[PDB]
Design a protein around this ligand. Structure first.
Ligand SMILES: *[C@@H](C)[C@H]1/C(=C/c2[nH]c(/C=C3N=C(/C=C4\NC(=O)C(CC)=C4C)C(C)=C\3CCC(=O)O)c(CCC(=O)O)c2C)NC(=O)[C@@H]1C
Ligand SMILES: *[C@@H](C)[C@H]1/C(=C/c2[nH]c(/C=C3N=C(/C=C4\NC(=O)C(CC)=C4C)C(C)=C\3CCC(=O)O)c(CCC(=O)O)c2C)NC(=O)[C@@H]1C
Ligand SMILES: *[C@H](C)[C@H]1/C(=C/c2[nH]c(/C=C3N=C(/C=C4\NC(=O)C(CC)=C4C)C(C)=C\3CCC(=O)O)c(CCC(=O)O)c2C)NC(=O)[C@@H]1C
Ligand SMILES: *[C@H](C)[C@H]1/C(=C/c2[nH]c(/C=C3N=C(/C=C4\NC(=O)C(CC)=C4C)C(C)=C\3CCC(=O)O)c(CCC(=O)O)c2C)NC(=O)[C@@H]1C
Ligand SMILES: *[C@H](C)[C@H]1/C(=C/c2[nH]c(/C=C3N=C(/C=C4\NC(=O)C(CC)=C4C)C(C)=C\3CCC(=O)O)c(CCC(=O)O)c2C)NC(=O)[C@@H]1C
Ligand SMILES: *[C@H](C)[C@H]1/C(=C/c2[nH]c(/C=C3N=C(/C=C4\NC(=O)C(CC)=C4C)C(C)=C\3CCC(=O)O)c(CCC(=O)O)c2C)NC(=O)[C@@H]1C
Ligand SMILES: *[C@H](C)[C@H]1/C(=C/c2[nH]c(/C=C3N=C(/C=C4\NC(=O)C(CC)=C4C)C(C)=C\3CCC(=O)O)c(CCC(=O)O)c2C)NC(=O)[C@@H]1C
Ligand SMILES: *[C@H](C)[C@H]1/C(=C/c2[nH]c(/C=C3N=C(/C=C4\NC(=O)C(CC)=C4C)C(C)=C\3CCC(=O)O)c(CCC(=O)O)c2C)NC(=O)[C@@H]1C
Ligand SMILES: *[C@H](C)[C@H]1/C(=C/c2[nH]c(/C=C3N=C(/C=C4\NC(=O)C(CC)=C4C)C(C)=C\3CCC(=O)O)c(CCC(=O)O)c2C)NC(=O)[C@@H]1C
Lengths: 160, 169, 67, 36, 161, 50, 160, 161, 160, 161, 160, 161
């Protein structure tokens, strides 16, 4: 979290917390209500975001779900939607934490090696997260959509 | 290193759960307590040298054998090392007050503290007595100042005494 | 060392044991002097009735050389 | 020559005193004085 | 094990002094919570087996864990899983009554990960089973006492982490 | 405190005389001024060791 | 405490707490204010109970303060009175906890081979805690002196 | 374990040869040193408890170890420390009689460092306790016996450190 | 006796007597004349040893002879002297047996809780046996006083 | 176990007195006889197996006792009788070293006559075996030493008979 | 040795050394010079005892070197004399140590299983050791041979 | 590490008093022995290859250790053993001139037992090598300086054993 980063940056140079870190933590605390609202509407609409974004992904990229594809079959399609729900949950965790380090520590270290072992196209996973970004950004106000799309675009950058 | 937000996220990640209303209530309580935590940390930012000096000036009168010969705070080298240790404890207590979670204390203070103190002959009882002296001073200063919430101040020091202290009963 | 030749009967109170239990129900035994107190207390908190006990070895009033 | 033997010679015993009650028991020392 | 009372007595005893006013406040807080703790412990002790039944039906039954090839397949392993869930419920009730997780640190989490790894016990499935116990207990007792039980149940889960 | 500090100064001076290295004096007197000046007169200490 | 002792017995029998010990924890948390009143009574009378008990001990057993004794001298009598304050603090902890475990884990297990190294007479320390009991019952009310006398008598029984 | 005689016998048996002249010389040295070892063992067996008593009074009483919060505060901790000192003194007497520190490896120093590290025992404080044991023992037992006891107790200290 | 210990060790190991213990029985059966010389010296001079040792104990530790002590009064000091006579008799039994098993089977087992019940300081009993040992060693011949004092200070070590 | 020395000590302790000259004379007699006792014990231990084998070979072998229909026919009964004779030789050697037959009364003569009467062990055949052992030991260890050995041997023979 | 046996016994009873065992160690220490003389004579003449006792063994038991025997053959008789030299060296070790535990640990534990696997008559090896003690008794002085034959006696008792 | 001077000053500092009556005696004995100890250090440092040469030639050469199957077979192992004996001689010189074995405790005996047990180096053969070192130094420097080196060399031997 932002609190974790500020405490770590103070402790690395072995001092108490600077006024800049206090101002940053104060901004984190004041934006906590809006961040909690964004996380609340994401976890409330968690099923329809995954459903609509998976539908848009499978319409835009039929090759991953056609026979010979990585996600062909109902079980592999359900596993792909489970992965999309996993990344939406990590997006909600990042929205709560105010930064990107829970998404990084849980689902973005070794993601390329994992999906290379799985045989899954990582650019198609990034397309799935981009469709989740578009569907979720259509479900909020403009500032909330930009704030959530920041974490979404971090996941896009880590996947591609 | 984990704060309250990070440990709640880890606890929900372990079960693979989305954040429910109880998690929203915990984060909401942390966010409204955060202003008081910031105020308390900014208070102890100013006074920290005076806190550790008066903590030494109370601890070495409660246990005066520390400054007598064969005590571990005898020479001024050992005295300055003890005051540096008290400054370390107050700095990480400030960190735990900001983070609202004692995982920072566990990871960066307590995991080798008995090992170092038993290696160098440093007592643990006078150390945790100094911890509680610092806790009483910060609680009294917060009660004197305009602090609406003072309940969270005693938590990192009590956690440090419980973790570091030898199990009596 | 001086030994006690004891004879006692201990009943079962908790379970109906389906194996043959007469040999550890009723028995005549040789217990040592230093272990006789704890053996008697063990079987006697267990709940048996001791029917007989004697000094198999040694003599009463032995000041030295009983070991 | 034979004054080489510092460690190998006869050791010199030190005078090490028993530890006494210290200034943390000043209250109990005053209490015992008023007990007399 | 340590409750809140023995924790306060320990913290005062390693200082060598008597209980000051903050110790009195902590004891009065524990005595205030003790009514709810005793009521919740009585309800759980009465409906002990029903919570385990509901949690097993919610999380473990009709799955690959209880199907052939799973670790809850054989009936000795099923009864072992039932006994483990009774262990978690009973020691979580103990930790609720004490107001501290030292009992879980000493007898429950003491090498439990090594034990389950040597046996082949599914850590994820038993974490979901403890979660089902938490949900059933919170439904049975209430919001506040269910949350108090869930603190130590999540402590057992994070020990299994 | 002042009397035991004076006797302790003389004791460590003799100990450094025996040791042949003033390193003990350097370590145990380098940082002593700031801690001692709060409740004891630093000029009085200078005249005392003089 | 009583809660820890009841949980230890229930865990040894591998069972939940019976409604009997649940009712005792109920009675204990109702009488917590009362047992804390004896706690602040002994805390306020800390420097007086052991004062009169040490005076009565020294007039009853003058061999303790005689030359050649275990507690001859100002320093040794100060250590003796420190042990008096230690045991009064342990009795305070016991009447706080409602069980004799905080007494016995600190000052009663191994006390015989603890004091045989120092030459301290066990029966004399027992008589000292006796005089603590009578002085506490002298300047404390009757039925609560019976409750405190239960833990004092446990100290006597485990020591002597 | 082994003494000096069995050490010579085991070395000659590992070599596969009989006792040569240097082996006889080492045996004659041990037979020369035996009487002082026997009378030293008699003196230490006489003053077994008292050496521990004045050593712990010399080093550890009225200090941070016996003050509250230290590792010798409670009576069970004091009894365990006195038990450890009795073990060290008895096994040092055994090593002094044998003329070899092999029994200290077999019985004492094989896992005691990990034992104290798990227990939280201050090995610096135990080292100072054994130095006090050295001083009190060398005060009572003589000079050459004091050297032998000091060598074996310093071996115990080196195994601890 | 030494022969009794050798017999019970050979019987416990279920074997004949070892060469070492056979040589020990032979050397003891030769040195029994000197052992009985020590015995007749001690029995002839038994009263002055215990009188001087009791006087030296009384001047060394006056808390015994003080009021409130363990031996207050002439009959109780006579009882203490009778106990010292018993210990000297057991030392004579030890030096005629060649082994400490008579002192174990008469006056060593249970002696700690014996004097715990009596209130007698067993460290002062050990001091009394030290005084008996040093007065006896000053009285009789030193080469035999070493052999007597081995059993004496084994008794001292078991007392302490 | 009661020997001559412990008998002297106990005969002193029953009246509580010290050792007089009357108890001194028998102790001097024991000290005079002890060298012959050690020599006889060394010879008996030197030829412990061969005495038993030779006495068995010329006393009861190829007879009706070891014939079928006899008690000593079966190899289990044969090994039991060999163990019994070795036990009699070893414990009579113990009695010869101790100077008293209390070891025989306390270790061998404790419920053995009724055991042999129950098992049908031939008393006369055991008497002949004991006499064969006694005369072989009397031929081997000497005249006076053999007779003093035979004192305990026919004492335990009369006790078992 | 006897020192190690006494230390092991004292550790088993958790006590210091009894003065009887201190006397046995003292007497072994004083009398070790005769044992060193015995061992020196044996290691000086160590081929002669093996030579004469092997000759006497091949006279008394020619079934050993008869065809079909265990030691039939040149190399087998060489291994026979090798075993005799091993047991002679063990007897020297036992004479030096003053106690028979090194002999028991090196060459008397599992000797029955070893020679049963090898097919070797254990009573014939006992006869060879007895003839070795006959030759050593002829070679040494009377008291020294009488003391040194007891270790041979223990070997005879364990093997036969 | 510490030396005799630091040990004296530390003991007097723990007492809080000056160097009253026996610290002065220890210091004057140390300074009296010091110039001859420096001369012995000069001789040992000048001749240091010869001591390890005569030690290996006296004790370890032409043995099972140097023949195949031994721990000194290969040339790397031989050179490592030469370097170890040089380490023992040099740190014995260090402890002999410091007057305290704390340098041996903190830089030699802290890990010597564990490195030799992990490597498989024969403890008895290393002890014999150090004994050859101490008699060669006693022959080459003198009886008194040989004993002053040999007490620390025997301290290293006791640390081995
Ligand atoms: C002819 C080759 C030269 C000669 C030889 C010489 N060598 C030694 C002594 C030893 N040499 C070794 C060497 C090795 N052992 C090994 O296992 C290996 C690797 C395979 C080597 C290289 C050893 C160990 C010894 C010591 C003997 C022992 O086994 O303990 C000597 C003896 C010197 C002495 O002082 O004893 C000699 C004479 N010398 C020459 O001048 C020829 C050039
Ligand atoms: C003769 C001395 C015996 C012998 C020795 C031997 N030693 C080694 C190797 C090592 N010795 C050490 C020890 C130390 N290093 C230090 O820095 C210090 C203190 C200053 C000490 C005491 C270590 C660490 C090693 C390993 C690496 C190294 O060479 O330093 C070996 C080699 C083991 C191998 O198999 O390579 C040997 C053989 N062996 C004997 O048999 C003689 C009795
Ligand atoms: C004033 C004229 C004199 C005086 C008094 C004084 N001393 C202290 C306390 C301390 N004194 C020391 C000094 C030393 N440390 C060392 O290592 C050595 C030897 C080189 C010395 C002499 C230290 C460390 C303390 C602090 C420990 C303690 O609390 O006792 C005080 C109290 C300071 C305060 O209350 O803040 C006072 C007033 N010191 C002098 O030197 C003058 C002789
Ligand atoms: C039933 C025919 C009659 C009878 C029964 C009765 N039995 C007991 C208890 C015991 N019975 C035995 C018997 C045996 N144990 C064995 O191992 C064997 C051989 C295989 C036998 C025959 C024993 C030992 C007991 C003691 C307890 C135990 O279970 O070990 C009781 C008494 C139960 C009690 O003690 O409370 C009774 C009453 N009594 C009748 O009237 C029936 C006609
Ligand atoms: C039929 C004779 C009776 C009956 C049966 C019944 N059983 C269940 C549920 C389960 N039974 C088992 C038992 C086993 N698993 C095994 O692997 C083995 C041995 C090979 C056994 C015996 C299990 C695991 C279940 C749970 C089902 C699952 O796979 O999750 C039920 C269902 C109860 C429910 O509440 O769902 C029923 C009805 N009921 C009767 O009345 C008959 C007497
Ligand atoms: C007074 C009633 C009697 C008496 C006491 C006496 N005690 C000591 C020394 C010690 N007593 C203890 C015991 C405890 N420490 C604890 O922390 C606790 C539990 C809370 C107990 C029970 C200890 C540790 C000591 C050592 C001193 C130290 O704290 O370091 C003495 C001194 C003996 C000496 O040799 O100094 C005395 C005199 N003696 C009597 O006769 C009275 C009956
Ligand atoms: C005394 C010098 C210091 C010290 C001691 C101390 N030790 C313990 C507890 C234990 N010590 C041991 C060690 C041994 N194991 C062995 O096999 C042997 C003999 C070869 C020894 C010496 C063990 C096993 C224990 C555990 C016993 C137990 O479980 O109670 C304690 C107690 C700590 C506690 O009970 O928590 C103490 C206090 N510590 C000091 O501070 C003294 C300076
Ligand atoms: C022949 C294969 C080997 C052999 C024989 C041998 N046997 C004896 C004498 C006896 N053997 C026994 C043993 C038994 N008791 C039984 O009941 C049975 C059958 C179940 C057996 C085998 C007994 C008792 C004797 C003694 C005879 C008696 O009745 O008294 C000897 C004589 C020993 C002696 O010292 O005279 C011999 C020689 N010996 C060999 O070498 C063949 C390998
Ligand atoms: C041998 C001289 C004659 C004889 C002996 C014979 N003995 C047994 C078996 C046993 N004898 C005992 C008794 C003892 N226990 C002891 O501890 C001691 C020494 C102190 C003795 C003497 C025991 C316990 C047995 C074993 C009982 C059993 O059978 O399990 C037997 C065997 C009897 C049988 O039925 O197998 C025999 C034959 N009888 C002769 O004919 C030999 C001349």
């Amino acid at each position: 979290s932002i609190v974790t980063k500020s405490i770590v940056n103070a402790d690395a140079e072995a001092r108490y917390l600077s006024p800049g870190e206090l101002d940053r933590i104060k901004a984190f605390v004041t934006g906590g209500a809006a961040r909690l609202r964004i996380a609340e509407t994401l976890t409330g609409s968690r099923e329809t975001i995954v459903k609509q974004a998976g539908d848009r992904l499978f319409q835009k990229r039929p090759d991953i779900v056609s026979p010979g594809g990585n996600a062909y079959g109902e079980e592999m399609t359900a596993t792909c939607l489970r992965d999309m729900d996993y990344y939406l949950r990590l997006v909600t965790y990042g929205v709560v934490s105010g930064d990107v380090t829970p998404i990084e520590e849980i689902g973005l270290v070794g993601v390329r090696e994992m999906y290379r072992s799985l045989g899954t196209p990582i650019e198609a996973v990034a397309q799935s997260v981009r469709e989740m970004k578009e569907v979720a950004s259509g479900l909020m106000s403009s500032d909330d959509a930009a704030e959530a799309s920041a974490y979404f675009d971090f996941v896009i950058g880590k996947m591609s | 290193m984990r704060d309250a937000v990070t440990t709640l996220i880890k606890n929900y990640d372990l079960t693979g759960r989305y954040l429910d209303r109880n998690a929203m209530d915990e984060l909401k309580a942390y966010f409204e307590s955060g202003s008081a935590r910031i105020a308390a940390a900014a208070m102890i930012n100013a006074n920290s040298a005076t806190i550790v000096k008066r903590a030494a000036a109370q601890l070495f009168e409660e246990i005066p054998e520390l400054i007598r010969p064969s005590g571990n705070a005898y020479t001024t080298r050992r005295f300055s090392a003890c005051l540096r240790d008290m400054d370390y404890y107050l700095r990480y207590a400030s960190y735990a007050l900001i983070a609202a979670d004692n995982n920072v204390l566990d990871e960066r203070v307590l995991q080798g503290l008995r090992e170092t103190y038993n290696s160098l002959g440093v007592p643990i009882g006078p150390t945790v007595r100094g911890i509680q002296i610092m806790k009483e001073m910060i609680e009294a200063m917060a009660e004197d100042s305009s602090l609406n919430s003072t309940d969270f101040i005693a938590s990192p020091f009590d956690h440090m005494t419980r973790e570091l202290s030898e199990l009596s009963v | 060392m001086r030994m006690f030749r004891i004879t006692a009967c201990v009943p079962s109170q908790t379970r109906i044991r389906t194996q043959r239990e007469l040999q550890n129900t009723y028995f005549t035994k040789l217990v040592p002097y230093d272990n006789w107190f704890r053996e008697q207390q063990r079987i006697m908190k267990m709940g048996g009735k001791i029917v007989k006990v004697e000094l198999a070895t040694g003599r009463p009033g032995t000041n030295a050389g009983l070991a | 020559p034979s004054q080489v033997a510092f460690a190998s010679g006869d050791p010199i015993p030190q005078n090490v005193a028993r530890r006494t009650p210290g200034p943390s028991l000043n209250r109990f020392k005053e209490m015992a004085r008023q007990v007399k | 094990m340590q409750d809140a009372i023995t924790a306060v007595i320990n913290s005062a005893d390693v200082q060598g002094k008597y209980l000051d006013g903050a110790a009195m406040d902590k004891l009065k807080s524990y005595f205030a919570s003790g009514e709810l703790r005793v009521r919740a412990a009585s309800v759980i002790s009465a409906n002990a087996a029903t919570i385990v039944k509901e949690a097993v039906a919610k999380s473990l039954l009709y799955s690959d864990v209880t199907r052939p090839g799973g670790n809850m397949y054989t009936t000795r392993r099923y009864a072992a899983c039932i006994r483990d869930l009774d262990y978690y419920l009973r020691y979580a009730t103990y930790a609720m009554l004490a107001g501290d997780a030292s009992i879980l640190d000493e007898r429950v989490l003491n090498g439990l990960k090594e034990t389950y790894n040597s046996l082949g016990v599914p850590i994820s499935s038993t974490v979901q089973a403890i979660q089902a116990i938490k949900e059933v207990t919170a439904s049975l007792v209430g919001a506040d006492a269910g949350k108090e039980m869930g603190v130590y149940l999540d402590y057992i889960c994070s020990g299994l982490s | 405190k002042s009397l035991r500090d004076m006797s302790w100064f003389l004791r460590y001076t003799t100990y450094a005389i025996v040791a042949g290295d003033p390193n003990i004096i350097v370590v145990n007197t380098r940082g002593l001024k700031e801690v001692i000046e709060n409740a004891c007169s630093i000029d009085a200490t200078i005249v005392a060791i003089q």
